[PDB]
Amino acid sequence: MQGVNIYNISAGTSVDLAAPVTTGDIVTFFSSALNLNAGAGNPNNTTLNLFAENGAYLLHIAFRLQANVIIFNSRQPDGPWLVEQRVSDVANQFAGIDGKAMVTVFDHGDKYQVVINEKTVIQYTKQISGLTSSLSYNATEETSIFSTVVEAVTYTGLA
Amino acid sequence: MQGVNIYNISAGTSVDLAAPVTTGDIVTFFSSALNLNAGAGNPNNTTLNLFAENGAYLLHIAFRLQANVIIFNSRQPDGPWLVEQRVSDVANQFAGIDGKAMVTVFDHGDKYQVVINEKTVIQYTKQISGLTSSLSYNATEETSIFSTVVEAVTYTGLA
Ligand SMILES: CC(=O)N[C@H]1[C@@H](Oc2ccc([N+](=O)[O-])cc2)O[C@H](CO)[C@H](O)[C@@H]1O[C@@H]1O[C@H](CO)[C@H](O)[C@H](O)[C@H]1O
Ligand SMILES: CC(=O)N[C@H]1[C@@H](Oc2ccc([N+](=O)[O-])cc2)O[C@H](CO)[C@H](O)[C@@H]1O[C@@H]1O[C@H](CO)[C@H](O)[C@H](O)[C@H]1O
């Protein structure tokens, strides 16, 4: 049966999913703020991650204000960062909506479709495969482009 | 061709969907407040609706604090309200989450699965079929159990 799960992630923390995200499933991160004027990242201002049970970074989404870019990557638990995919113009992706933001990830099996608010920003071909069993939102209060608390909603059992 | 559409509905208004909601699709209403101490409804404190192209209420979700019940019903544009399905203990459905809430609707074709937060409250057998062309959130800035503006998110092209 289709299901909805809600998690509240504090900047810099992770949450274990009660229902893993697999092929055909959906995950959306919700921010109750949009701070496109925050200081520079070191180098990241904000990141959202989809973890496998073994700790692999299935999907790493990093937002860099000063570099004006959004990075999409993956990584094994004890391996090096893999091939980065970049998308310039950070502010442009959040256009049309101020004060809050949304990042959605459709798990399509061979790829992760990433949507910023209503705009699909990338069709990310997976570098690592696996069920998403954990999620994290990493940032500080000072330089995150999102609210200190980011709400994550998963839609599972869809296929 | 999955897609995400975002709408911000002010209490008492309707919004037209850019991408219709049909079998296999999902729509979630997000409230940035939870007012279980609001004045009595008249009889509704808050209603969320899915409308067909012809104005028919495909799904009418009515929250009644005083009556301590949630109504699920349908009706043709110029027809009478049909057979109500009801669920008691309103506050109980929102248990565990204070200050906000969400109501998700899964269009399963023959039924609408309504989920408040993570809790499935009803498997509503459709009284009227068709694609959802519009949505609405009806209430007053004084007795709604939700925030004045409710955000509606649709995930379409999932089937
Ligand atoms: C500080 C900074 O901008 N780091 C970038 C930079 O890091 C490197 C690393 C190695 C070399 N090199 O051997 O020539 C050059 C630059 O570029 C990297 C990509 O080439 C990364 O963008 C790195 O930042 C790291 O990115 C990963 C994701 O790929 C992750 O976000 C890390 O937290 C981040 O430090
Ligand atoms: C004020 C109130 O509690 N209205 C209820 C009530 O209305 C009726 C109507 C007819 C009869 N009757 O012929 O014996 C009794 C009560 O009960 C109705 C269901 O029987 C409705 O619940 C009505 O509220 C209306 O419900 C519809 C959805 O079904 C919609 O929410 C309307 O806005 C609401 O007024």
UniProtKB/Swiss-Prot annotation, chains A, B:
InterPro entries in the cross-refs: ConA-like_dom_sf, Galectin_CRD
Domain of life: Eukaryota
Segments forming domain Galectin: 13-156
Protein EC: 3.1.21.-
EC category name: hydrolase
PROSITE patterns referenced in this protein's UniProt entry, alphabetically: GALECTIN
Residues forming coiled coils: none
Alphabetical GO biological process terms: apoptotic process; positive regulation of apoptotic process
Tissue: Detected in the fruiting body.
Any one GO molecular function term: DNA nuclease activity
Protein's job: Anti-tumor lectin with DNase activity. Inhibits the growth of several tumor cell lines in vitro. Induces lymphocyte infiltration and necrosis of tumor cells in a mouse tumor model. Induces apoptosis in HeLa cells. Binds N-acetylneuraminyl lactose (N-acetyl-alpha-neuraminyl-(2->3)-beta-D-galactosyl-(1->4)-beta-D-glucose).
Protein's name according to its UniProt entry: Anti-tumor lectin
Species assigned in the record: Cyclocybe aegerita (Black poplar mushroom)
